[PDB]
């Protein structure tokens, strides 16, 4: 029962943890219950629980997290299902001439092959369902309608109940709690800071202790660079709401923000690299610029956290100086290596000596690359 | 018409570039087209054309590109619709006591609630797809049943249609032209080699031109972590075909290849970061090294490439030596450099000057990462 009690205690680590989940499976157990509700009080015709079943399927598939998410998909596979039942009661209606059967036959041949090798392409590998929803659609209504003898007015009765279920979806969906897309990527920026920042101080702080917890946070910035640009898409679909003020909010800079500051993590990347390297400095030489690293990656985590803090706030106040202390931190070890950097040169007795400067070399060129940054976020605050 | 042009264009290289594609989908135009002709042979019973779009609909969602994904999800969503078809059967059977509808209404609710908000795992942020169709099942299999008097003469009629589906499905995907799982993989790694040591050369090539196609290289190497063991649960599934001699064939190394290659990688990941640093060693400074950092790259490029070549044909004879001029070369390098290493210091005028010896650096400890490498791939070759 261990087994068991450490996967029901990870569950309730989960759920305490993160008490979004809870609400979104309640709103989905609600409306399959009011959609069943719905269908529980009327059953005069077979065609009725044929709908109603179509209606279960639609309010399940067409549910999902966020609400630009549910509009934006929803709206692709409408787009898809309406493309697909015009071609299939065109090529079913027209497919009449005084052989027709085969005339029906090869056209899924046709419009088959073409789906399931063009849905191969690399550039629409994301819409797996636009594409795999439209060859369901015009397979099923050309069949149904083609062993049928008219379908047209029955066709209608299966598409009525589908926004049924859709409009139901949609409803509780977008009224009752909104879990947005748009707001769900300011909370991710502002957390790419965190992160980072924590990193930062982790990366140094691990350089000089001698005689993973820091692996996750620059990871997590590098490979969440794949998922921003997919809330993207998520959050144009979102209406004026919160207080972002007008139409069309200018979520392009908070990919440009998690783009600058992902440029200058690839710094830490290499920063936490060199104390994995096969090849390291001496512990006699590296508690020499304790004084010095330090100071510097004391005030590079500090500014990260402070510009991570402001995004939270968007400070509309306007700040007066950011990377002045940094600097100077980073200056005094740059102009404090001179003193000692004798001691790395006059194969690996010497190799190893060497494999200290290129630790602060690293981090100098961090602080460099930190101040395209307040760049961007100089320009993103002024129009936000 | 440019636009489609290039459209098409662009189309048609695709497809003469890969043609695995065309193959796939005439492989599932085919199978669509032959359960269509078994279809349109006998249309006796309205049920015959009900259970005709469930054939057509299961060979369409159990149809997918690889010979182990296509076994291994089939099993999986057989395994869901079985678990759901059972619970939803029992709870409609067991539901009726002598208001039983609430009874059977509200545990909808319950496993609705669920499975949607127990999907969200973490570690089940995979498999979507096995908890959404056992959500489908009983939900579909309950609201027919509960509508239904008896729904139990009526069910297994849809299954056995779902089976020949599957039947005809799986049969034509595994017999005609089989597109494994397990030699993708293979041809993956042995990419992973080619496309890292262009990736090196284009690095150190491009260090010292003054007076990304480099890009591409590393980050796919670094980016691809998370789709050979993707490829791993894919490959399990396959049968002892090809050359490949037993059962469980030991695609564990394959990924400790693949992961011993990506440690390495991190250096040129770090070593290509230097020439877009904001601060860099000035030309003058550069091009004293030529005949000493080509070298070096030359061989680690020449090893790179030599091993993976191995790889593809997983060399039975046995290797002499592999790491030897590499070796050399980075040691020539370490014994070069201290003649001229009182050329990086006694700011900014001196930052630059020694941002030389971080990139010098960075290449001997990629050399040394690089001798893990070929330890991993000396157990590999030993036991494959």
Redo the contacts between chains.
Sequence with gaps: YDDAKDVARK?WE?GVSDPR??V???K???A??IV??L??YQ?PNPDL?RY??WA??TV??V?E?TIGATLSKGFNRALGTLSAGGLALGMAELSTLFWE?IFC??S???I???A???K???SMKAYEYGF?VF??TY??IL??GF??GQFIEVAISRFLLIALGAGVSLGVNMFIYPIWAGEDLHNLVVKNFMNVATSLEGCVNGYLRCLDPVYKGYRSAV?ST?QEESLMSFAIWEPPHGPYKSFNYPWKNYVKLSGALKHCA??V??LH?CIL???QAPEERRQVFRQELQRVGVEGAKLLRELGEKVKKMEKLGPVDLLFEVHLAA?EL??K??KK??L?????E??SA??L??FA??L??FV??L?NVVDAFKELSQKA
Tied chains: 1, 2.
Excluded at 344 to 348: D, I
Aim: proline share 1%; net charge negative; with cysteine.
């Design positions: 569950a989960m989940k809870i979104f499976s309640a989905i157990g609600l399959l219950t069943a509700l269908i529980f059953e629980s109603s079943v279960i399927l399940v598939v549910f997290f059967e036959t090869l899924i041949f046709c088959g092959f073409l399931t090798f063009m191969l392409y690399p795999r060859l369901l397979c099923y069949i149904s062993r049928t490979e794949s690839f710094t990347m290499a690299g390297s096969e090849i200056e740059q102009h290596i001179d950097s004798y790395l040169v006059n194969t690996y010497s190799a060497l494999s400067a290129t070399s690293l100098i060129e460099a690359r101040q």
